[PDB]
Design a protein around this ligand. Structure first.
Ligand SMILES: *[C@@H]1O[C@H](CO)[C@@H](O[C@@H]2O[C@H](CO)[C@@H](O)[C@H](O)[C@H]2NC(C)=O)[C@H](O)[C@H]1NC(C)=O
Ligand SMILES: *[C@@H]1O[C@H](CO)[C@@H](O[C@@H]2O[C@H](CO)[C@@H](O)[C@H](O)[C@H]2NC(C)=O)[C@H](O)[C@H]1NC(C)=O
Ligand SMILES: Clc1ccc(C[C@H]2CCCN2C2CCN(c3ccccn3)CC2)cc1
Ligand SMILES: Clc1ccc(C[C@H]2CCCN2C2CCN(c3ccccn3)CC2)cc1
Ligand SMILES: [Cl-]
Lengths: 362, 361
């Protein structure tokens, strides 16, 4: 089973124990670690952070004691110009030079492959996307033609029905990508102005949601339906939760909200919490397991957060193995309790270790 | 059969032949004409346009030479803060004041009843809605007790399953409403694609985003939920919803970049009055959607779904099969009231089609 785990470069900047560097990662924990994100410097694959070239090294020396560990470089992101991905994907010369430039970069900095993180291609850029991947795979074979171990190519694809419809030719692109990663989180299935879980496994209660689309189960099934082979499907499990400030006093799913949750001390972004911040939050909080969705939320005062714990990630890995998917994708390593200092037991990476155990178990 | 027809006061302001006043309304066309909309101010029902009293009189004059015609005043609309209506309905004092104020107002200005057009009650408002409808119906009963012709009470209810589930207690409120007008248009059925806003049936199954975005599902659902057929009036639009096409695909589900170009008179992107559509049909190609029994028109990069005489004949046939109370029309001023744009100088071609289709056997 594949275990694809993202590391974010900007996570190096968090205060105190929140600071995460590629040397703090377990080299046996994941099968695939994806550095995010690499930039586009006018049609060339460039670096993003000043010390990227350094952290690249910091990550890839983890391959010294583990050979089967494979690393990829994610180009794109969401704070990256989407139009600055389109205008570079629609001109033939631009695509040519970028594709030619990717393999020398990946070899210079010791990456095993490339991960496409375009969030998100429009309708006007759907077809181009396809051909992009088609050519991006092609050159790779050429680069590996002189008896070299060929580079990997992956794409992180949206899990919302509208976006998959408007941007992906899943059937065609599934033959050229080594694996696809379904971002089965950040769902917005809650009633307007009400609490809801951003990563439910199933729909759960029928009349407590507008659509049966905003959940992991439907997204995985739809992906399979549109031609993606399960052998190349990696299901995303979040090591973060989405939070709200309760407006009235109710605290169940569908309770009114006055806005996003209070920011975490380290991640500092309203409406989100890292799992270790959640473990802090759990002190004095009440945990409820949403019956139909197989995932927990925690409430405490006027705060409400939907997240994943060891139990729920075990359930998600079970759903994965049933569907005979390729494995699990984790966003992201630096959001798990990587230091082990928040969720007790002095144990590092509790969520990702639960995922790996559940994958290896029988 | 009831024929409920809405007149909108703001149509008085449209340019040229689009200007529509109540004296342009055929006094024999409909069985009920509802004036839209009335305001709520200081928890009293009140006028909205500066000349509402005059226009009330122009409308209620049509009863002199036609005693059988009834008129109602519609309170609400979509430019009325549902926040406000919620405050009035939940606050007991505001609610009682509004209720007490309605009958003297309707009597003073010559109306036969009230139409409730709260668009829309929230989840938290559903029960409030019921209470309102109940107590209002009681007040009328009290005001009419000494041998008076009781005021009517009606409501315009969404045809959207989600809205119906969160907002209305159909079985309770249909006990007190004299009729329910179900707004079977403006249907939201896949993003970025053309689609008919008032299809009769679901049509081709794999071309439908869902099962509930059509007239037939809404009618059957509100029947299922306890609304009697004898109290159900089915909405038929004299307008079309328009899109601007992104490609050479012109069928149902073709990609779009946004709402259609505004009409010359109605000046609202994504909508077109029926007489505007008649102007648009000149040089256009019309396709009847097989499964959905409604037409759409296309020309250049423009695509509009709407109703014509054939489709409203079919919709009337449906509602008669279902033994409903009749048809509701939004709106009189969007039909070709001048008779100039469509047909052969026939006034109200769509509404007259509906009326004749109701009259047949
Ligand atoms: C990522 O690459 C883009 C494209 O080269 C960079 O965007 C440029 O930013 C500079 C400074 O803000 C501007 O003067 C240029 O006009 C931008 N160029 C384009 C094409 O948009 C961006 O600086 C790079 N980001 C990082 C972190 O390296
Ligand atoms: C409908 O009635 C409401 C409620 O009184 C009116 O809202 C007020 O409008 C005045 C005039 O500008 C404002 O100064 C007040 O602040 C508004 N009050 C509230 C509570 O919103 C509204 O103007 C009336 N509309 C019409 C067309 O008569
Ligand atoms: Cl505490 C915290 C935790 C998480 C976030 C960011 C989340 C929430 C908003 C969007 N964001 C997701 C992350 C994964 N997304 C992916 C995944 C894989 C590949 C590419 N993009 C893109 C959107 C901020 C603060
Ligand atoms: Cl040319 C033109 C034609 C029609 C419109 C308005 C349509 C379209 C958007 C919403 N709107 C409907 C009409 C009927 N609606 C009703 C019906 C009955 C009772 C109460 N409200 C409320 C929503 C604008 C311009
Ligand atoms: Cl149902």
């Amino acid at each position: 089973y594949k275990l694809v785990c993202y590391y974010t470069s900007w996570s190096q900047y968090r205060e105190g124990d929140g600071s995460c560097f590629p040397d703090a990662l377990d080299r046996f924990l994941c099968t695939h670690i994806i550095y995010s994100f690499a930039n586009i410097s006018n049609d060339h694959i460039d670096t993003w952070e000043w010390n990227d070239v350094t952290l690249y090294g910091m990550l890839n020396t983890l391959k010294n004691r583990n050979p089967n560990l494979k690393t990829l470089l994610s180009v794109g992101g969401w704070n990256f110009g989407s139009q600055r991905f389109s205008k570079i994907a629609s001109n033939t010369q631009s695509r040519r030079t970028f594709i030619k430039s990717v393999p020398p970069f990946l070899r210079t900095h010791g990456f095993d492959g490339l991960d496409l993180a375009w969030l998100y291609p429009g309708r006007r850029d759907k077809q181009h996307f396809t051909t992009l991947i088609k050519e991006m795979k092609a050159e790779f074979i050429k680069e590996a033609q002189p008896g070299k171990k060929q580079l990997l190519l992956s794409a992180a694809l949206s899990a919302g029905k509208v976006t998959i419809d408007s941007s992906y030719d899943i059937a065609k692109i599934s033959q050229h990508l080594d694996f696809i990663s379904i971002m089965t989180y950040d769902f917005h299935g809650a009633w307007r102005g009400t609490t809801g879980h951003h990563s439910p496994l199933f729909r759960g209660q029928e009349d407590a949601s507008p659509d049966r689309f905003s959940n992991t189960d439907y997204a995985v099934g739809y992906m399979l339906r549109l031609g993606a082979p399960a052998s190349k499907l990696v299901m995303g499990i979040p090591t973060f939760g989405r939070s709200f400030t309760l407006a009235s006093s109710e605290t169940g799913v569908g309770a009114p909200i006055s806005g996003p949750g209070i920011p975490g001390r380290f991640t500092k972004e309203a409406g989100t919490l890292a799992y270790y911040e959640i473990c802090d939050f759990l002190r004095g909080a009440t945990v409820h397991r949403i019956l139909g969705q197989q995932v927990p939320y925690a409430t405490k005062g006027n705060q409400w957060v939907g997240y994943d714990d060891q139990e729920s990630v075990k359930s998600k890995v079970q759903y994965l193995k049933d569907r005979q998917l390729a494995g699990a994708m984790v966003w992201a390593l630096d959001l798990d309790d990587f230091q082990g200092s928040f969720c007790g037991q002095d144990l590092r990476f509790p969520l990702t270790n639960a995922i790996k155990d559940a994958l290896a178990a029988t």
